[PDB]
Ligand binder design. Sequence first.
Ligand SMILES: Nc1ncnc2c1ncn2[C@@H]1O[C@H](COP(=O)(O)OP(=O)(O)O)[C@@H](O)[C@H]1O
Ligand SMILES: Nc1ncnc2c1ncn2[C@@H]1O[C@H](COP(=O)(O)OP(=O)(O)O)[C@@H](O)[C@H]1O
Ligand SMILES: Nc1ncnc2c1ncn2[C@@H]1O[C@H](COP(=O)(O)OP(=O)(O)O)[C@@H](O)[C@H]1O
Ligand SMILES: [Mg+2]
Ligand SMILES: [Mg+2]
Ligand SMILES: [Mg+2]
Lengths: 56, 56, 375, 375, 375
Amino acid sequence: SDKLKEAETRAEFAERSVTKLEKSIDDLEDELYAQKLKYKAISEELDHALNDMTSI
Amino acid sequence: SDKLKEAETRAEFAERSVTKLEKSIDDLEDELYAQKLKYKAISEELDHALNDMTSI
Amino acid sequence: DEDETTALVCDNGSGLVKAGFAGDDAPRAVFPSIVGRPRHQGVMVGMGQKDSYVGDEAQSKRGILTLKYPIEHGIITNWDDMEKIWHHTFYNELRVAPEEHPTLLTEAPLNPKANREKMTQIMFETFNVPAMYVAIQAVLSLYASGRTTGIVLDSGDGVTHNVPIYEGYALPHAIMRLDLAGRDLTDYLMKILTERGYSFVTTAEREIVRDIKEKLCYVALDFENEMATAASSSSLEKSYELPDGQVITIGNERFRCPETLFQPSFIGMESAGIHETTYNSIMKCDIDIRKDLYANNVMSGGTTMYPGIADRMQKEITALAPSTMKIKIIAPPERKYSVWIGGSILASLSTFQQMWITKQEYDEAGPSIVHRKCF
Amino acid sequence: DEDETTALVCDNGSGLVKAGFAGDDAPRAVFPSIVGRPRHQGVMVGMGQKDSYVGDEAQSKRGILTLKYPIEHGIITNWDDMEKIWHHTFYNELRVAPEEHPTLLTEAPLNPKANREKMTQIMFETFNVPAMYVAIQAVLSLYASGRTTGIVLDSGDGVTHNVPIYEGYALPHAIMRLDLAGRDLTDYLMKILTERGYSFVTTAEREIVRDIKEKLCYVALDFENEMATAASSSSLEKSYELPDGQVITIGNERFRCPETLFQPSFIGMESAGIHETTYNSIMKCDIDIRKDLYANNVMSGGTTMYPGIADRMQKEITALAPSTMKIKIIAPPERKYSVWIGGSILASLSTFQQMWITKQEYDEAGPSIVHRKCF
Amino acid sequence: DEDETTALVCDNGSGLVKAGFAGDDAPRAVFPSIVGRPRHQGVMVGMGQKDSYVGDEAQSKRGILTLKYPIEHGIITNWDDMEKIWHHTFYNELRVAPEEHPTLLTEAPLNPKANREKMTQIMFETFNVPAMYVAIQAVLSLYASGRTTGIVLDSGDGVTHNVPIYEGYALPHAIMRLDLAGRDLTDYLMKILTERGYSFVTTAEREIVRDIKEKLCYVALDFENEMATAASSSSLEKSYELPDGQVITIGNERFRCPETLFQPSFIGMESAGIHETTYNSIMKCDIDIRKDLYANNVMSGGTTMYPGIADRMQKEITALAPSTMKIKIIAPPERKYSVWIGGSILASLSTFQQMWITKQEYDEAGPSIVHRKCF
Ligand SMILES: Nc1ncnc2c1ncn2[C@@H]1O[C@H](COP(=O)(O)OP(=O)(O)O)[C@@H](O)[C@H]1O
Ligand SMILES: Nc1ncnc2c1ncn2[C@@H]1O[C@H](COP(=O)(O)OP(=O)(O)O)[C@@H](O)[C@H]1O
Ligand SMILES: Nc1ncnc2c1ncn2[C@@H]1O[C@H](COP(=O)(O)OP(=O)(O)O)[C@@H](O)[C@H]1O
Ligand SMILES: [Mg+2]
Ligand SMILES: [Mg+2]
Ligand SMILES: [Mg+2]
């Protein structure tokens, strides 16, 4: 019974670590996707300005 | 004893999940880093363009 | 029984039955859908001598009973079997009478309409439930996720369904059912174990090998390279302790069993892997929202307790679809109860009793009323 | 082979390939556009062990082959597949060498110009045809009808095209392509039969259910009233004898399958029924001739063998358009060969060899010459 | 809402609705004139389930809605649609009540008088606007330019109008409407992209291809020479990144799409290019001022954001007209808001409230009063 309790404690520790890392990954994931949405926007717009060079 | 093997099973499950999540976090943070740096470089260049506009 | 007349919430999932009361967080009576019958006739006396055995009783009495499945891939064998198991669940397991509590049930996706009409009619005649509602498990898993956008992969024990739902609206035109499920997994593992020297046919070993799938199985990151390195693989090879005490060692098979769903050509299906079925499903609908479907895919079912589905899923979809937007899967722990949770969610709000299927409506229009009352 | 150097006439219709000699009344070699490939690998010896299977050979060997479509809705998968099937048609089926006979081909309406340039280039390099001409199937069906005024509804197996032509002139500004065709019909019928209890995915059952569509299907005169009376409908309900011997009974589905083209909202298309597509097409052009278009509508394709398109067509157009002038449809029996007949008609007259696309023109200007030689 | 009772300024342009307060420089609520409706029926609950969707909401929900146009080329389908969109604009977008602010509206040139009478009557009954004024968008664009002499080319999304006005005087005898507009542009581009291998029918791809027209399209300086050099044109060929992530490459089509307005014979119009329509318009009026019309031409509309209209315009007019006097076009940036700006200009001066169309005048003479109160 004592060994079962120690193993259960360690398993619960690991599982809480799992959940916390998953939440951190979520936050990072959202930030990276937004970063990239705006990166592609600014890149396209620099290209549009270059198109302006073509129109000139 | 059956409960103890089940505890060891869930512990190993959670530990493998932890390792996967840690590696994912590291790679995601490196990718986000490089992405933000490239966006910062383009933003730099665009700021220089704004400064030139002001000089006009 | 609670003093209040709260509703019954019962998920008759294809592989597991999970029943309880509305307002509860988890179903109270959860049992597999196996049903045991006496393998021989009666000559002894003093105990036993009972026909139907259901639930943990049959689990303990697996060896003495012919183990039969009243439902397989949605098809219904004998309504009497459901009658008995529902009696057992309501009275011996839930300790509840269906007279005073309306029932919310969940059904397998795209279940026969004739099946619905017959099951509802036998139900209403046999039982005295005051009111009724039945819903597809897809929207239930959606409710458990609590996000109106996404494609649900329901991996039951008889069928795997891919259903896209955008902003809480069903897309039947892009919904498909695949005949690969737990049964296939057990079969394929059975033949591989036969090639490993152990050849069993009976259902007890079926449950043993599905337990092995629950415990030890991998989802290979790269298939042929992992068997190539699994040639010897003393560390990678993994063993199990069967209840009789023998140590059974399995290596590449751990990740060669779930792979069959991904690679159906192993045992001869024209349909490609389930990732192709999610891919085609996505493109059938308008182009624009497809990216959101990529980013909002959900997976549900008891099988989902296995590792490896998430990484394989994302990598293959990114291989098939352009890698601009980031694809991420969401799957809450213990999601096999999630459907039942959604049932409780349905009973949570006060609008749900506006469309209870009451006794008098069925008495007026027969079973046909459900054709107009649910959809 | 005929002693004379008469031309080859080949209709590569989207769903059927019909090939023969010029001056003939009907194509000699007619086969569906399915292509079968070995489902597994080679270990046996003594017979078979051949990759490509085309024509009736693949029809007999449907079960053992993965059945794939080298063309779907005009899109080209693998030119090698066309290479092999044309080899088979010319030598094993037509018993003709393309060296000594120029080829007249028909292409699906609004086919890609890049598709034309690549197919012509691979053709000219691989084959040794002396001369070439390719035409749209719309004017071919017009020629089969032999009336320069009318709107052609070409219902192939991948696309349905509506094309107006007044006094023998094309109106591309009022031409449209709809992604509803045989494929959709089979799909929709597949899901309804799934709701009837029979769920198949493979192509053999696809051909079985399209055969069912050929034999038993109705076009409902009034839709919801006919399902209302088809509730029981012992007489109206119709059965089929599947080759395995089981009797499969279908009722309202007979007229609920083709209705989907008329009512696309069943499986989610923004475009309305094909009658709306003919209507809009008509009004896009000048008002005055519209009446003639109403009175001169033609329908063409293999699907046209089904009953019910004519009555539905006229009634709905009369509902949409004023009912002063009388609208009448014309459709000669066995019109799926009609396009090929028109090809023979093209070779009938002595002016046709003024604009054969010879080898030396292609050698001079590359494929680009067709851009100036056909249109 | 401002403390002052200043008037509402609303431009219901054929393609865009731009609304705001008088005295403001730019309209506050600007949205396209598309309207989305639920593609299917209601079975779900908990969210959504709303009929009309307008503005950015419908833009986000484009895939789930049938996208319909309440106005096309001036023709009105359903006044209820305008009722709902005006409700949305006034309360959900402008956060203003029309009770306390008179409305200045702009209408498409040569709009039906019956249309004006019905729209004004439904407006006055449904709404409680204190006072009214409606004006042609031509004089509004003139006001934005602030020069009483010139010919206005109003290129909306349904019609293109050429209207000459000399010294702030309308010339209806020399005003014409051409049925070429954004719709035609999208259609023609749709058929060319179909010939490029990509065939779509739904409205989401319509918006995608009009976005492509906004971004990449050219106006060819010389047409056939530019396709001749665009044969290969690796540098001249331009690509777009569609939101799904696929790279779609287009070459000559960039300048072959707007060319159709200049060359209507591509898809069959008797009327020649819009430059011919400005030319005829000019000569219809007295000879002498024609030179001023040549030198004072103005162009207005959202399309004007594209490059190439100015150079093409001047060169062709100089080709048609004698090249003694210098022709120059004027077009301020962001001129699609210019009409609304002119509306604010109308409210700027204190004489404008002398001819507000008050409630009591309409109550006395019905809608007919506008026949005497505006013109
Ligand atoms: N704790 C668990 N771990 C792993 N697999 C499980 C577990 N419980 C059940 N399963 C698997 O789930 C399957 C039953 O699926 P089920 O959840 O009934 O599908 P559905 O979601 O359609 O009801 C069984 O065949 C079993 O192999
Ligand atoms: N004898 C028949 N009766 C009914 N339908 C048929 C028959 N033969 C072919 N079809 C249908 O016609 C379709 C093929 O159309 P097809 O004639 O190839 O179009 P196209 O005229 O564009 O070549 C097939 O999908 C099949 O279902
Ligand atoms: N920023 C933009 N760049 C290029 N084209 C645009 C832009 N905004 C709108 N348009 C085009 O303008 C059209 C709408 O014209 P609109 O300005 O409503 O005409 P009107 O001036 O008669 O109101 C749309 O079809 C769209 O293609
Ligand atoms: Mg499941
Ligand atoms: Mg056809
Ligand atoms: Mg305009």
